């Protein structure tokens, strides 16, 4: 069902569509890396969209992070920007979702709430420090969710929350958001973190530099999100100061530390 692609759409494909660096990797029973996307199975939809995006081979961070996430192991990864981090986590996550489906849980619930008052339960949550990074992540998600049942969404401050609220209502299996706006959404009862199995923190060090830790601890520890060990968590940070080390200690479980040249 959720594994079978939908009929193509010329209109969308229009809209939608340095290496060999040594890597450090610490942790228990760390899953082996891939040299090509076909080394592991991610389904027709993913492989189909990888072709459309013209991704020949995985980048370094993609080579080690993808199989680790596929194996449902928590991850802490220090990689520079512009290294393919985004896809490194969206491909395996989206692949997992297509394979498993939404579940009879979120399925037998697609019809709740009232007209103009629907609560959404994202299966996946991605936190970014800025509207720019959030939008990028979001665009990459649309390309990989092309011809799939997954509907990506993105919310952030600095723009009307009204339009954003109306977009969420239409459905949201994967949510990209800046911490501030997401907290707003939750207080307004528009978002529930009860079924969130995938949590990604992109550029965590940048988020703390901006003082987003309170809102993030609020989002992850002071609410309804499944705890570590149950949910699958991934952290991406270019630097690794003590604050980030502590943030990883609290949010990650028996994780793998991945350093791509830094
Ligand atoms: N495996 C890949 N092969 C070829 N190009 C890629 C690959 N992964 C990402 N890119 C290119 O890099 C860009 C995305 O960079 P990005 O992943 O957003 O950096 P970051 O992860 O730090 O945000 C895309 O526009 C895409 O063309």
């Amino acid at each position: 069902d959720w594994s079978k692609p939908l009929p193509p759409s010329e209109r969308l494909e229009q809209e939608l569509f340095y290496d060999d660096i040594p890597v450090e990797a610490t942790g228990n029973n760390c899953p082996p890396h891939i040299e090509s996307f076909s080394d592991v199975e991610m389904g027709e939809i993913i492989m189909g969209n990888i072709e459309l995006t013209r991704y020949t081979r995985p980048t370094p961070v993609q080579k080690h992070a993808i199989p680790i996430i596929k194996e449902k192991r928590d991850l802490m990864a220090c990689a520079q920007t512009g290294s393919g981090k985004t896809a490194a986590f969206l491909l395996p996550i989206l692949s997992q979702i297509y394979s498993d489906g939404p579940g009879e849980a979120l399925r037998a619930m697609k019809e709740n709430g009232r007209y103009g008052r629907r609560k959404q339960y994202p299966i996946s949550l991605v936190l970014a420090p800025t509207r720019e990074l959030a939008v990028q992540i979001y665009e990459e998600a649309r390309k990989f969710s092309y011809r799939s049942r997954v509907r990506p969404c993105v919310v952030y401050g600095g723009a009307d929350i009204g339009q954003q609220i109306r977009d969420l209502e239409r459905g949201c299996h994967l949510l990209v958001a800046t911490p501030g706006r997401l907290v707003d959404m939750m207080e307004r009862g528009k978002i529930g973190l009860d079924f969130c199995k995938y949590l990604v923190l992109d550029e965590a060090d940048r988020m703390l530099d901006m003082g987003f830790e309170p809102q993030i601890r609020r989002i992850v520890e002071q609410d309804t999100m499944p705890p570590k060990g149950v949910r699958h968590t991934m952290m991406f940070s270019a630097t690794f100061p003590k604050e980030i080390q502590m943030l990883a200690r609290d949010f990650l479980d028996e994780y793998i530390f991945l350093a791509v040249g830094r």
Side-chain angles (χ1 to χ4, degrees), residues 1-17 20-103 105 108-262:
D1 183 34
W2 270 44
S3 47
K4 316 304 290 182
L6 303 185
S9 173
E10 55 291 347
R11 185 194 67 89
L12 272 175
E13 298 188 33
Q14 303 285 306
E15 303 282 303
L16 294 187
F17 322 92
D20 62 304
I21 27 188
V23 164
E24 178 176 56
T26 319
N28 300 316
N29 310 80
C30 186
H33 75 289
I34 61 178
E35 285 302 325
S36 82
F37 297 121
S38 65
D39 281 320
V40 298
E41 181 57 10
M42 305 199 277
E44 316 164 50
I45 299 175
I46 296 298
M47 298 306 292
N49 294 318
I50 277 169
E51 298 187 301
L52 289 165
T53 56
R54 291 148 227 159
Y55 282 12
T56 299
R57 50 195 184 68
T59 59
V61 71
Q62 281 165 15
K63 281 194 281 190
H64 307 81
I66 289 177
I68 281 167
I69 298 186
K70 186 70 177 175
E71 300 274 272
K72 293 173 183 173
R73 294 298 300 293
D74 273 14
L75 172 76
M76 175 59 245
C78 301
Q80 221 156 301
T81 71
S83 61
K85 282 196 283 76
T86 311
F89 61 78
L90 293 176
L91 295 174
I93 290 174
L94 282 171
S95 181
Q96 270 307 326
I97 297 169
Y98 303 150
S99 184
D100 303 320
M109 177 183 265
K110 296 179 182 298
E111 42 186 354
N112 282 356
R114 331 304 169 188
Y115 179 78
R117 199 169 70 59
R118 322 271 179 186
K119 190 179 174 179
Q120 294 301 306
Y121 292 106
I123 303 169
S124 187
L125 174 57
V126 176
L127 298 172
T130 57
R131 171 178 181 174
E132 289 62 63
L133 185 48
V135 166
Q136 286 165 51
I137 297 170
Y138 171 76
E139 282 296 315
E140 199 87 324
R142 287 186 70 210
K143 304 198 311 191
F144 296 123
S145 51
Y146 169 62
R147 295 185 65 187
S148 76
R149 306 302 183 70
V150 168
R151 184 167 188 281
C153 275
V154 62
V155 297
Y156 47 75
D160 180 56
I161 199 171
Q163 206 63 60
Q164 290 180 3
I165 293 179
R166 287 186 289 289
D167 180 48
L168 272 162
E169 292 183 55
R170 288 171 163 60
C172 178
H173 309 82
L174 183 143
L175 174 64
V176 181
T178 47
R181 184 51 58 85
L182 172 59
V183 170
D184 202 320
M185 296 300 187
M186 290 163 79
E187 303 184 316
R188 291 171 172 264
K190 300 305 175 184
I191 288 291
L193 301 175
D194 299 70
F195 301 68
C196 186
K197 292 295 183 178
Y198 304 93
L199 172 67
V200 178
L201 285 103
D202 200 6
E203 290 198 44
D205 61 347
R206 198 151 178 292
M207 295 199 283
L208 304 197
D209 291 334
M210 298 165 96
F212 279 123
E213 194 171 335
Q215 293 104 299
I216 290 169
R217 297 257 184 193
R218 156 73 154 299
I219 291 159
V220 174
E221 307 182 304
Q222 292 146 50
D223 207 79
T224 187
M225 190 175 280
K228 57 170 175 179
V230 180
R231 64 159 195 273
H232 182 181
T233 309
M234 297 135 274
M235 284 184 62
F236 287 87
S237 172
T239 62
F240 196 55
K242 204 56 175 288
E243 41 170 44
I244 295 299
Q245 294 181 51
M246 256 286 90
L247 187 52
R249 247 55 186 294
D250 308 333
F251 292 10
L252 310 173
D253 188 60
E254 295 182 300
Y255 70 93
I256 302 294
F257 180 74
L258 184 181
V260 183
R262 46 169 43 244

PDB file of all heavy atoms in Angstrom, residues 29-59:
ATOM      1  N   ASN A  29      28.448  -2.298  18.263  1.00  0.00           N
ATOM      2  CA  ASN A  29      27.909  -2.988  17.096  1.00  0.00           C
ATOM      3  C   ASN A  29      27.475  -2.028  16.004  1.00  0.00           C
ATOM      4  O   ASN A  29      26.364  -2.130  15.479  1.00  0.00           O
ATOM      5  CB  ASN A  29      26.721  -3.859  17.505  1.00  0.00           C
ATOM      6  CG  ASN A  29      27.032  -4.749  18.691  1.00  0.00           C
ATOM      7  OD1 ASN A  29      27.004  -4.303  19.837  1.00  0.00           O
ATOM      8  ND2 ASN A  29      27.340  -6.012  18.420  1.00  0.00           N
ATOM      9  N   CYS A  30      28.354  -1.094  15.660  1.00  0.00           N
ATOM     10  CA  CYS A  30      28.043  -0.113  14.635  1.00  0.00           C
ATOM     11  C   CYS A  30      27.850  -0.746  13.270  1.00  0.00           C
ATOM     12  O   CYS A  30      28.734  -1.431  12.767  1.00  0.00           O
ATOM     13  CB  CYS A  30      29.143   0.931  14.540  1.00  0.00           C
ATOM     14  SG  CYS A  30      28.680   2.243  13.409  1.00  0.00           S
ATOM     15  N   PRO A  31      26.685  -0.516  12.647  1.00  0.00           N
ATOM     16  CA  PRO A  31      26.384  -1.075  11.326  1.00  0.00           C
ATOM     17  C   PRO A  31      27.366  -0.614  10.251  1.00  0.00           C
ATOM     18  O   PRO A  31      27.800   0.534  10.239  1.00  0.00           O
ATOM     19  CB  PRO A  31      24.948  -0.615  11.075  1.00  0.00           C
ATOM     20  CG  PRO A  31      24.837   0.620  11.866  1.00  0.00           C
ATOM     21  CD  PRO A  31      25.567   0.301  13.136  1.00  0.00           C
ATOM     22  N   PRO A  32      27.742  -1.517   9.333  1.00  0.00           N
ATOM     23  CA  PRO A  32      28.687  -1.174   8.258  1.00  0.00           C
ATOM     24  C   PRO A  32      28.168  -0.128   7.289  1.00  0.00           C
ATOM     25  O   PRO A  32      26.965   0.093   7.204  1.00  0.00           O
ATOM     26  CB  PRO A  32      28.967  -2.521   7.592  1.00  0.00           C
ATOM     27  CG  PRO A  32      27.736  -3.323   7.882  1.00  0.00           C
ATOM     28  CD  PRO A  32      27.354  -2.940   9.281  1.00  0.00           C
ATOM     29  N   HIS A  33      29.073   0.516   6.557  1.00  0.00           N
ATOM     30  CA  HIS A  33      28.682   1.556   5.612  1.00  0.00           C
ATOM     31  C   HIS A  33      28.349   1.043   4.217  1.00  0.00           C
ATOM     32  O   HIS A  33      28.545  -0.142   3.904  1.00  0.00           O
ATOM     33  CB  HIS A  33      29.782   2.607   5.494  1.00  0.00           C
ATOM     34  CG  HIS A  33      30.970   2.153   4.700  1.00  0.00           C
ATOM     35  ND1 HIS A  33      31.860   1.204   5.161  1.00  0.00           N
ATOM     36  CD2 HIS A  33      31.424   2.531   3.478  1.00  0.00           C
ATOM     37  CE1 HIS A  33      32.807   1.021   4.258  1.00  0.00           C
ATOM     38  NE2 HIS A  33      32.566   1.812   3.230  1.00  0.00           N
ATOM     39  N   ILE A  34      27.839   1.950   3.383  1.00  0.00           N
ATOM     40  CA  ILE A  34      27.480   1.631   2.012  1.00  0.00           C
ATOM     41  C   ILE A  34      28.343   2.460   1.071  1.00  0.00           C
ATOM     42  O   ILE A  34      28.840   3.524   1.457  1.00  0.00           O
ATOM     43  CB  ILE A  34      25.987   1.967   1.702  1.00  0.00           C
ATOM     44  CG1 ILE A  34      25.734   3.468   1.896  1.00  0.00           C
ATOM     45  CG2 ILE A  34      25.057   1.148   2.586  1.00  0.00           C
ATOM     46  CD1 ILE A  34      24.309   3.895   1.566  1.00  0.00           C
ATOM     47  N   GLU A  35      28.522   1.963  -0.157  1.00  0.00           N
ATOM     48  CA  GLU A  35      29.285   2.671  -1.186  1.00  0.00           C
ATOM     49  C   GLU A  35      28.288   3.143  -2.234  1.00  0.00           C
ATOM     50  O   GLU A  35      28.526   4.103  -2.961  1.00  0.00           O
ATOM     51  CB  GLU A  35      30.335   1.760  -1.829  1.00  0.00           C
ATOM     52  CG  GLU A  35      31.573   1.491  -0.967  1.00  0.00           C
ATOM     53  CD  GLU A  35      32.313   2.766  -0.564  1.00  0.00           C
ATOM     54  OE1 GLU A  35      32.361   3.721  -1.378  1.00  0.00           O
ATOM     55  OE2 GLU A  35      32.861   2.808   0.565  1.00  0.00           O
ATOM     56  N   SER A  36      27.150   2.468  -2.301  1.00  0.00           N
ATOM     57  CA  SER A  36      26.103   2.851  -3.239  1.00  0.00           C
ATOM     58  C   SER A  36      24.735   2.662  -2.581  1.00  0.00           C
ATOM     59  O   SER A  36      24.570   1.839  -1.672  1.00  0.00           O
ATOM     60  CB  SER A  36      26.187   2.021  -4.535  1.00  0.00           C
ATOM     61  OG  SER A  36      25.568   0.758  -4.392  1.00  0.00           O
ATOM     62  N   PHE A  37      23.761   3.436  -3.045  1.00  0.00           N
ATOM     63  CA  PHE A  37      22.413   3.393  -2.506  1.00  0.00           C
ATOM     64  C   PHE A  37      21.735   2.040  -2.626  1.00  0.00           C
ATOM     65  O   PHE A  37      20.825   1.729  -1.861  1.00  0.00           O
ATOM     66  CB  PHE A  37      21.558   4.445  -3.193  1.00  0.00           C
ATOM     67  CG  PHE A  37      22.014   5.868  -2.948  1.00  0.00           C
ATOM     68  CD1 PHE A  37      22.367   6.690  -4.019  1.00  0.00           C
ATOM     69  CD2 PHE A  37      22.022   6.398  -1.660  1.00  0.00           C
ATOM     70  CE1 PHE A  37      22.713   8.023  -3.825  1.00  0.00           C
ATOM     71  CE2 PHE A  37      22.365   7.733  -1.444  1.00  0.00           C
ATOM     72  CZ  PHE A  37      22.708   8.551  -2.527  1.00  0.00           C
ATOM     73  N   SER A  38      22.167   1.227  -3.578  1.00  0.00           N
ATOM     74  CA  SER A  38      21.542  -0.078  -3.757  1.00  0.00           C
ATOM     75  C   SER A  38      22.091  -1.127  -2.799  1.00  0.00           C
ATOM     76  O   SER A  38      21.600  -2.253  -2.767  1.00  0.00           O
ATOM     77  CB  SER A  38      21.720  -0.556  -5.205  1.00  0.00           C
ATOM     78  OG  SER A  38      23.090  -0.772  -5.500  1.00  0.00           O
ATOM     79  N   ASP A  39      23.111  -0.769  -2.027  1.00  0.00           N
ATOM     80  CA  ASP A  39      23.685  -1.716  -1.088  1.00  0.00           C
ATOM     81  C   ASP A  39      22.655  -2.143  -0.051  1.00  0.00           C
ATOM     82  O   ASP A  39      22.694  -3.270   0.444  1.00  0.00           O
ATOM     83  CB  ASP A  39      24.924  -1.136  -0.410  1.00  0.00           C
ATOM     84  CG  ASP A  39      26.149  -1.207  -1.294  1.00  0.00           C
ATOM     85  OD1 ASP A  39      26.320  -2.235  -1.982  1.00  0.00           O
ATOM     86  OD2 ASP A  39      26.946  -0.245  -1.293  1.00  0.00           O
ATOM     87  N   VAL A  40      21.740  -1.239   0.287  1.00  0.00           N
ATOM     88  CA  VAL A  40      20.668  -1.567   1.226  1.00  0.00           C
ATOM     89  C   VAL A  40      19.374  -1.370   0.447  1.00  0.00           C
ATOM     90  O   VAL A  40      19.376  -0.764  -0.623  1.00  0.00           O
ATOM     91  CB  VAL A  40      20.671  -0.654   2.470  1.00  0.00           C
ATOM     92  CG1 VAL A  40      21.974  -0.837   3.232  1.00  0.00           C
ATOM     93  CG2 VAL A  40      20.461   0.808   2.061  1.00  0.00           C
ATOM     94  N   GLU A  41      18.267  -1.890   0.956  1.00  0.00           N
ATOM     95  CA  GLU A  41      17.007  -1.737   0.237  1.00  0.00           C
ATOM     96  C   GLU A  41      16.158  -0.640   0.836  1.00  0.00           C
ATOM     97  O   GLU A  41      15.846  -0.665   2.015  1.00  0.00           O
ATOM     98  CB  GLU A  41      16.224  -3.057   0.222  1.00  0.00           C
ATOM     99  CG  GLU A  41      14.899  -2.968  -0.529  1.00  0.00           C
ATOM    100  CD  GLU A  41      15.066  -2.511  -1.973  1.00  0.00           C
ATOM    101  OE1 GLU A  41      16.218  -2.452  -2.456  1.00  0.00           O
ATOM    102  OE2 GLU A  41      14.044  -2.214  -2.628  1.00  0.00           O
ATOM    103  N   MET A  42      15.781   0.321   0.010  1.00  0.00           N
ATOM    104  CA  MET A  42      14.974   1.428   0.476  1.00  0.00           C
ATOM    105  C   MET A  42      13.654   1.563  -0.279  1.00  0.00           C
ATOM    106  O   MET A  42      12.927   2.541  -0.104  1.00  0.00           O
ATOM    107  CB  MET A  42      15.795   2.711   0.395  1.00  0.00           C
ATOM    108  CG  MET A  42      17.096   2.580   1.158  1.00  0.00           C
ATOM    109  SD  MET A  42      17.880   4.127   1.573  1.00  0.00           S
ATOM    110  CE  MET A  42      18.743   4.462   0.051  1.00  0.00           C
ATOM    111  N   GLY A  43      13.345   0.568  -1.110  1.00  0.00           N
ATOM    112  CA  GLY A  43      12.100   0.581  -1.852  1.00  0.00           C
ATOM    113  C   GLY A  43      12.121   1.299  -3.183  1.00  0.00           C
ATOM    114  O   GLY A  43      13.064   2.022  -3.512  1.00  0.00           O
ATOM    115  N   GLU A  44      11.042   1.109  -3.934  1.00  0.00           N
ATOM    116  CA  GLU A  44      10.885   1.688  -5.259  1.00  0.00           C
ATOM    117  C   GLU A  44      10.807   3.201  -5.231  1.00  0.00           C
ATOM    118  O   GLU A  44      11.432   3.886  -6.035  1.00  0.00           O
ATOM    119  CB  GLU A  44       9.593   1.191  -5.902  1.00  0.00           C
ATOM    120  CG  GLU A  44       9.316  -0.274  -5.743  1.00  0.00           C
ATOM    121  CD  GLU A  44       7.868  -0.604  -6.053  1.00  0.00           C
ATOM    122  OE1 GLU A  44       7.380  -0.177  -7.127  1.00  0.00           O
ATOM    123  OE2 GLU A  44       7.226  -1.288  -5.221  1.00  0.00           O
ATOM    124  N   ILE A  45       9.998   3.706  -4.314  1.00  0.00           N
ATOM    125  CA  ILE A  45       9.781   5.135  -4.197  1.00  0.00           C
ATOM    126  C   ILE A  45      11.070   5.901  -3.966  1.00  0.00           C
ATOM    127  O   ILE A  45      11.354   6.848  -4.681  1.00  0.00           O
ATOM    128  CB  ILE A  45       8.755   5.428  -3.095  1.00  0.00           C
ATOM    129  CG1 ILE A  45       7.426   4.765  -3.472  1.00  0.00           C
ATOM    130  CG2 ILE A  45       8.571   6.927  -2.939  1.00  0.00           C
ATOM    131  CD1 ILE A  45       6.324   4.851  -2.419  1.00  0.00           C
ATOM    132  N   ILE A  46      11.862   5.481  -2.989  1.00  0.00           N
ATOM    133  CA  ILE A  46      13.121   6.155  -2.708  1.00  0.00           C
ATOM    134  C   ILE A  46      14.062   6.047  -3.911  1.00  0.00           C
ATOM    135  O   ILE A  46      14.568   7.063  -4.408  1.00  0.00           O
ATOM    136  CB  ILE A  46      13.847   5.549  -1.477  1.00  0.00           C
ATOM    137  CG1 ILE A  46      13.022   5.755  -0.201  1.00  0.00           C
ATOM    138  CG2 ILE A  46      15.193   6.211  -1.308  1.00  0.00           C
ATOM    139  CD1 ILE A  46      12.799   7.230   0.173  1.00  0.00           C
ATOM    140  N   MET A  47      14.297   4.819  -4.371  1.00  0.00           N
ATOM    141  CA  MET A  47      15.196   4.607  -5.498  1.00  0.00           C
ATOM    142  C   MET A  47      14.678   5.357  -6.709  1.00  0.00           C
ATOM    143  O   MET A  47      15.452   5.901  -7.486  1.00  0.00           O
ATOM    144  CB  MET A  47      15.329   3.119  -5.822  1.00  0.00           C
ATOM    145  CG  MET A  47      15.928   2.282  -4.704  1.00  0.00           C
ATOM    146  SD  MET A  47      17.519   2.890  -4.121  1.00  0.00           S
ATOM    147  CE  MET A  47      18.557   2.583  -5.551  1.00  0.00           C
ATOM    148  N   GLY A  48      13.361   5.394  -6.859  1.00  0.00           N
ATOM    149  CA  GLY A  48      12.779   6.108  -7.975  1.00  0.00           C
ATOM    150  C   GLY A  48      13.124   7.583  -7.912  1.00  0.00           C
ATOM    151  O   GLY A  48      13.557   8.159  -8.900  1.00  0.00           O
ATOM    152  N   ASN A  49      12.942   8.194  -6.745  1.00  0.00           N
ATOM    153  CA  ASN A  49      13.215   9.619  -6.569  1.00  0.00           C
ATOM    154  C   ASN A  49      14.704   9.978  -6.529  1.00  0.00           C
ATOM    155  O   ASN A  49      15.083  11.115  -6.824  1.00  0.00           O
ATOM    156  CB  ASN A  49      12.510  10.120  -5.307  1.00  0.00           C
ATOM    157  CG  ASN A  49      11.005  10.064  -5.437  1.00  0.00           C
ATOM    158  OD1 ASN A  49      10.457  10.401  -6.485  1.00  0.00           O
ATOM    159  ND2 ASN A  49      10.325   9.648  -4.378  1.00  0.00           N
ATOM    160  N   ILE A  50      15.543   9.022  -6.145  1.00  0.00           N
ATOM    161  CA  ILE A  50      16.981   9.265  -6.114  1.00  0.00           C
ATOM    162  C   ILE A  50      17.397   9.467  -7.567  1.00  0.00           C
ATOM    163  O   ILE A  50      18.186  10.353  -7.882  1.00  0.00           O
ATOM    164  CB  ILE A  50      17.743   8.064  -5.522  1.00  0.00           C
ATOM    165  CG1 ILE A  50      17.727   8.148  -3.995  1.00  0.00           C
ATOM    166  CG2 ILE A  50      19.168   8.004  -6.070  1.00  0.00           C
ATOM    167  CD1 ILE A  50      18.204   6.897  -3.320  1.00  0.00           C
ATOM    168  N   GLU A  51      16.843   8.642  -8.447  1.00  0.00           N
ATOM    169  CA  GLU A  51      17.141   8.749  -9.863  1.00  0.00           C
ATOM    170  C   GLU A  51      16.730  10.131 -10.371  1.00  0.00           C
ATOM    171  O   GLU A  51      17.517  10.823 -11.009  1.00  0.00           O
ATOM    172  CB  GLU A  51      16.394   7.672 -10.652  1.00  0.00           C
ATOM    173  CG  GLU A  51      16.771   6.255 -10.267  1.00  0.00           C
ATOM    174  CD  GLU A  51      16.143   5.214 -11.173  1.00  0.00           C
ATOM    175  OE1 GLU A  51      14.896   5.168 -11.262  1.00  0.00           O
ATOM    176  OE2 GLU A  51      16.898   4.440 -11.796  1.00  0.00           O
ATOM    177  N   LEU A  52      15.493  10.527 -10.073  1.00  0.00           N
ATOM    178  CA  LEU A  52      14.990  11.809 -10.529  1.00  0.00           C
ATOM    179  C   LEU A  52      15.822  12.979 -10.026  1.00  0.00           C
ATOM    180  O   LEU A  52      15.970  13.965 -10.735  1.00  0.00           O
ATOM    181  CB  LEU A  52      13.518  11.976 -10.125  1.00  0.00           C
ATOM    182  CG  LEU A  52      12.511  11.092 -10.873  1.00  0.00           C
ATOM    183  CD1 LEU A  52      11.173  11.077 -10.153  1.00  0.00           C
ATOM    184  CD2 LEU A  52      12.341  11.601 -12.294  1.00  0.00           C
ATOM    185  N   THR A  53      16.384  12.875  -8.823  1.00  0.00           N
ATOM    186  CA  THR A  53      17.192  13.969  -8.288  1.00  0.00           C
ATOM    187  C   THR A  53      18.609  13.935  -8.841  1.00  0.00           C
ATOM    188  O   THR A  53      19.369  14.892  -8.686  1.00  0.00           O
ATOM    189  CB  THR A  53      17.269  13.933  -6.753  1.00  0.00           C
ATOM    190  OG1 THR A  53      17.758  12.660  -6.332  1.00  0.00           O
ATOM    191  CG2 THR A  53      15.904  14.150  -6.150  1.00  0.00           C
ATOM    192  N   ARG A  54      18.959  12.829  -9.487  1.00  0.00           N
ATOM    193  CA  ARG A  54      20.283  12.661 -10.083  1.00  0.00           C
ATOM    194  C   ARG A  54      21.405  12.476  -9.069  1.00  0.00           C
ATOM    195  O   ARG A  54      22.466  13.096  -9.181  1.00  0.00           O
ATOM    196  CB  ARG A  54      20.611  13.846 -10.994  1.00  0.00           C
ATOM    197  CG  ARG A  54      19.781  13.890 -12.255  1.00  0.00           C
ATOM    198  CD  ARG A  54      19.533  15.317 -12.682  1.00  0.00           C
ATOM    199  NE  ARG A  54      18.124  15.519 -13.003  1.00  0.00           N
ATOM    200  CZ  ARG A  54      17.520  16.702 -13.011  1.00  0.00           C
ATOM    201  NH1 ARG A  54      18.215  17.798 -12.712  1.00  0.00           N
ATOM    202  NH2 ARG A  54      16.223  16.788 -13.306  1.00  0.00           N
ATOM    203  N   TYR A  55      21.157  11.627  -8.079  1.00  0.00           N
ATOM    204  CA  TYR A  55      22.148  11.320  -7.060  1.00  0.00           C
ATOM    205  C   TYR A  55      22.807  10.021  -7.508  1.00  0.00           C
ATOM    206  O   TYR A  55      22.199   8.955  -7.452  1.00  0.00           O
ATOM    207  CB  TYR A  55      21.482  11.134  -5.688  1.00  0.00           C
ATOM    208  CG  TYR A  55      21.109  12.427  -4.980  1.00  0.00           C
ATOM    209  CD1 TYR A  55      21.131  13.650  -5.657  1.00  0.00           C
ATOM    210  CD2 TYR A  55      20.704  12.423  -3.649  1.00  0.00           C
ATOM    211  CE1 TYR A  55      20.759  14.838  -5.031  1.00  0.00           C
ATOM    212  CE2 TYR A  55      20.328  13.603  -3.005  1.00  0.00           C
ATOM    213  CZ  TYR A  55      20.356  14.810  -3.704  1.00  0.00           C
ATOM    214  OH  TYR A  55      19.987  15.990  -3.081  1.00  0.00           O
ATOM    215  N   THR A  56      24.047  10.118  -7.971  1.00  0.00           N
ATOM    216  CA  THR A  56      24.767   8.944  -8.439  1.00  0.00           C
ATOM    217  C   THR A  56      25.207   8.079  -7.262  1.00  0.00           C
ATOM    218  O   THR A  56      24.713   6.963  -7.076  1.00  0.00           O
ATOM    219  CB  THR A  56      25.992   9.358  -9.291  1.00  0.00           C
ATOM    220  OG1 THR A  56      25.539  10.089 -10.434  1.00  0.00           O
ATOM    221  CG2 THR A  56      26.772   8.131  -9.771  1.00  0.00           C
ATOM    222  N   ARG A  57      26.127   8.600  -6.463  1.00  0.00           N
ATOM    223  CA  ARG A  57      26.620   7.863  -5.314  1.00  0.00           C
ATOM    224  C   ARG A  57      26.456   8.663  -4.025  1.00  0.00           C
ATOM    225  O   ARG A  57      26.383   9.893  -4.042  1.00  0.00           O
ATOM    226  CB  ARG A  57      28.082   7.463  -5.532  1.00  0.00           C
ATOM    227  CG  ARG A  57      28.993   8.592  -5.977  1.00  0.00           C
ATOM    228  CD  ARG A  57      30.301   8.035  -6.524  1.00  0.00           C
ATOM    229  NE  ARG A  57      31.262   9.080  -6.873  1.00  0.00           N
ATOM    230  CZ  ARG A  57      31.866   9.870  -5.990  1.00  0.00           C
ATOM    231  NH1 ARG A  57      31.609   9.738  -4.695  1.00  0.00           N
ATOM    232  NH2 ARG A  57      32.734  10.786  -6.400  1.00  0.00           N
ATOM    233  N   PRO A  58      26.374   7.971  -2.884  1.00  0.00           N
ATOM    234  CA  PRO A  58      26.212   8.687  -1.611  1.00  0.00           C
ATOM    235  C   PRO A  58      27.440   9.478  -1.234  1.00  0.00           C
ATOM    236  O   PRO A  58      28.549   9.079  -1.566  1.00  0.00           O
ATOM    237  CB  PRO A  58      25.931   7.567  -0.612  1.00  0.00           C
ATOM    238  CG  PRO A  58      26.720   6.390  -1.209  1.00  0.00           C
ATOM    239  CD  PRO A  58      26.384   6.508  -2.688  1.00  0.00           C
ATOM    240  N   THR A  59      27.244  10.603  -0.546  1.00  0.00           N
ATOM    241  CA  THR A  59      28.372  11.414  -0.089  1.00  0.00           C
ATOM    242  C   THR A  59      28.896  10.696   1.146  1.00  0.00           C
ATOM    243  O   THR A  59      28.242   9.787   1.671  1.00  0.00           O
ATOM    244  CB  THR A  59      27.946  12.806   0.354  1.00  0.00           C
ATOM    245  OG1 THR A  59      26.999  12.684   1.424  1.00  0.00           O
ATOM    246  CG2 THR A  59      27.336  13.574  -0.789  1.00  0.00           C
TER     247      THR A  59
END
